Design a protein around this ligand. Structure first.
Ligand code: COT
Ligand code: COT
Lengths: 179, 227, 227, 179
């Protein structure tokens, strides 16, 4: 926070303008509120509940990223590290510090900002953000069939059925090579 | 074509060429049609970036200038360059202020739009105020305060304490009091009240209680901690 | 005034306004006097920054362009914007290349200066080659290679293996072979030989060994590790 | 190292153009070299010998900073953390992790780049770099009387005689408040 002439002093804040930031545990409520609309309203299920969301943001916030429109969180990606080729049920609530794959637990864009290319900018951004981390050689996520062609535009490849079941839902596993 | 301009604008933002992005959004605004929320964000972001660049260069060349003690000539170099930057800065402000007065505020149908553009008006007069001198200053500072005050007024009536736009205005308006008006106490009141009311609404557990503006709140408390 | 221009140039560098910094150094160069090492660094840095900005915007708008799915939908927008950026990029390169041909290389009295400006000549033709369209490309790539080759020639004769300028040329010249010429093997030879020779000189513990160019060497090995 | 479209891949390197970087242990030889010209030739003594320089760069490289002119190191500042009000003899070879003051052990500009304002840009830069670090509230250094007026231009204040003796040399202590 540059104050020319005053080295250790931090400059006051004013409203920012579109930025990408790691999410904080305090941003958890805003995530779950988007998840209510985005996931819970269609399937009656969602990737992470508030507690689970807060967990990953306290444990590994650097594996998360959100697009903030002038201070408002409108799109996110909550992740953690995994240490196996395939995703398993138990990996939903696990973060493996010495893992090698960035496990994207949830990705969602606020309904009033969808179809503007913002979800893609975020995903691309996230792949670069985590790809830069010296141990993360791959990215993994599960999605329903409809979103498979979408994710292939980012380098993800179909890895068949995902061993993870959420409620009464089944998904296709996707793998994306990075470093 | 309006679409092409927006498409090129979203392109320039990614290419990090904000002066281009601003030019595109200035053209879209000049077709007299009310901007969509997306187009509005694009315009705000283009300009916040275009002007912020000059503001940053200004602060550094000013610091250098006041630290050039003794060297009349080396200090005059910074003086002239700073002025060169101030003209650039002045033009940018007048640009958006004109856009505001001619298309943005007149087309503002909703209160959310009226407060956004009114805050934006206070914003640019503030930036203009950061470099003003002479008698021009007293006037610029009033212009800023009156736009901010009107937005604040509407904000209190039509927006929830946790609304991102209501909260953003709180932040910028309190900073206006703090550094432009030298009124620490009032500045802190503005900020604390806003933060506390937002916290109050959230403590009720309402789906309506935004939770989208977490950042603008952290920003507010940081400023408080600072002051 | 030459001094004022340099003073304003050092000022623009700090203010992060590299287009101004370049303009200042372009004027100093246009007074036909040989540049001091400082003025030379200032010119190199101004331009490396001015052009790097456009190169970066180019890479991103190009990526976006091929990615673009569908037909000539907004595929044509990126295409045009990319071309707009290419013209800007082209102008910048012709600017320094002209400066080089008219004042910089002709005034180069020492071999250290001759290799610096010759490398800089290869550099800008390389940047020009990165956006080179079809038939114009062949010629540009020869122009780059010939300046680089001449500098390399003089480098081997008048500079120690550990010299920052000799080493700098090694890096840029090997990358030229790697991505502009698609010659991985030759690219790696250039880089490896340069690194090894530098290491050798440092190994004899002599007084003439540089150890100022540690970074350029790490850069060289990183590239090797990469290829 | 941005490669648009390839998230985990690092872009190749080409010659940079003036930058400020934390020094690495490998930059120690270049540091001692400037010190030979810059100090050993006038007083027959220098702040840190190669071993001592290498030590600080391995232990706390984040407390160091150099101006690199197109890949060439031409100016540096080697530091470490101190945890007392005044500097003592033993603090010359000490780095205190939980310290609160950035102890500038040595500051020098290559003879061919002096009087260009580059030493000032570096010092200013370093005060911002370390001042940003959450525990570093002050900066401390010792210099001979001639340099006292120079250091005051950066916020340093005369703190009387320094308790540290190098060879047959005495210096004035300087303190600079940051955060
Ligand atoms: C999809 C997304 C992020 C795109 O953003 P955007 O709207 O900004 O999109 P852009 O504008 O950037 O791009 C638009 C493109 O997105 C694709 N797309 C968008 N909507 C689509 C759809 N309905 N079907 C197929 N492709 C579609 C298209 O290809 C479309 O191109 P076209 O214009 O050519 O069609 C955004 O629309 C969003 O937040 N959606 C709701 C939440 C969600 O689904 N998260 C992804 C879960 S997949 C990842 C994940 O979170 N897994 C956890 C797995 C999980 C655990 N529990 C669950 C419970 C329920 C569901 C899932 C889970
Ligand atoms: C001084 C410095 C860094 C400035 O850089 P620059 O040349 O780029 O300067 P700028 O262009 O940025 O600014 C110029 C200004 O620097 C000041 N200045 C420069 N030379 C001066 C001089 N001889 N006397 C008084 N003021 C002078 C002036 O005020 C001058 O302004 P004027 O233009 O108005 O005069 C640069 O010239 C340099 O590397 N010098 C040699 C090493 C050194 O002395 N390190 C400082 C040890 S004090 C810190 C330290 O390392 N302590 C360890 C203590 C130590 C332990 N063992 C030792 C053994 C011997 C000596 C010291 C030690």
């Amino acid at each position: 926070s540059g104050i020319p002439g005053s080295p250790g002093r931090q400059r006051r804040h004013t409203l920012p303008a579109n930025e990408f930031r790691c999410l904080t545990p305090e941003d958890a409520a805003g995530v779950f509120e988007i998840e209510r609309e985005a996931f819970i309203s269609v399937s009656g299920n969602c990737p992470l509940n508030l507690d689970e969301v807060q967990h990953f943001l306290t444990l590994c916030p650097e594996l998360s990223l959100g697009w903030f429109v002038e201070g408002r969180l409108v799109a996110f990606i909550i992740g953690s590290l995994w240490d196996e080729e395939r995703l398993t049920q138990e990996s939903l609530a696990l973060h493996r510090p010495r893992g090698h794959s960035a496990h994207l637990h949830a990705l969602a864009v606020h309904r009033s900002f969808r179809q503007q290319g913002k979800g893609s900018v975020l995903l691309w951004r996230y792949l670069h953000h985590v790809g830069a981390q010296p141990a993360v050689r791959r990215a993994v996520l599960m999605c329903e069939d409809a979103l498979v062609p979408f994710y292939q535009r980012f380098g993800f490849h179909p890895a068949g059925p995902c061993a993870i079941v959420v409620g009464s839902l089944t998904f296709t596993e996707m793998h994306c090579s990075l470093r | 074509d309006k679409n092409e301009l927006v498409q090129k604008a979203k392109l320039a933002e990614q290419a990090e060429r904000y002066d281009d992005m601003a030019a595109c959004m200035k053209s879209v605004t000049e077709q007299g049609a009310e901007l969509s929320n997306e187009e509005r964000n694009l315009l705000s972001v283009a300009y916040k970036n275009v002007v912020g660049a000059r503001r940053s260069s200004w602060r550094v060349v000013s610091s250098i200038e006041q630290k050039t003690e003794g060297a009349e000539k080396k200090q005059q170099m910074a003086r002239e360059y700073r002025e060169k930057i101030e003209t650039e800065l002045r033009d940018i402000c007048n640009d958006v202020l004109s856009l505001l007065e001619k298309f943005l505020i007149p087309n503002a149908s909703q209160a959310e739009s009226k407060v956004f553009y009114l805050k934006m008006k206070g914003d640019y007069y503030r930036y203009l105020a950061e470099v003003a001198a002479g008698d021009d200053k007293k006037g610029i500072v009033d212009q800023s305060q009156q736009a901010y005050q009107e937005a604040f007024e509407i904000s209190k009536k039509e927006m929830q304490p946790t609304h991102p736009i209501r909260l953003g205005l709180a932040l910028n308006f309190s900073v206006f009091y703090y550094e432009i008006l030298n009124s620490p106490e009032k500045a802190c009141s503005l900020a604390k009240t806003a933060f506390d009311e937002a916290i109050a609404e959230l403590d009720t557990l309402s789906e309506e209680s935004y939770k989208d503006s977490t950042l603008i709140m952290q920003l507010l408390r940081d400023n408080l901690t600072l002051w």
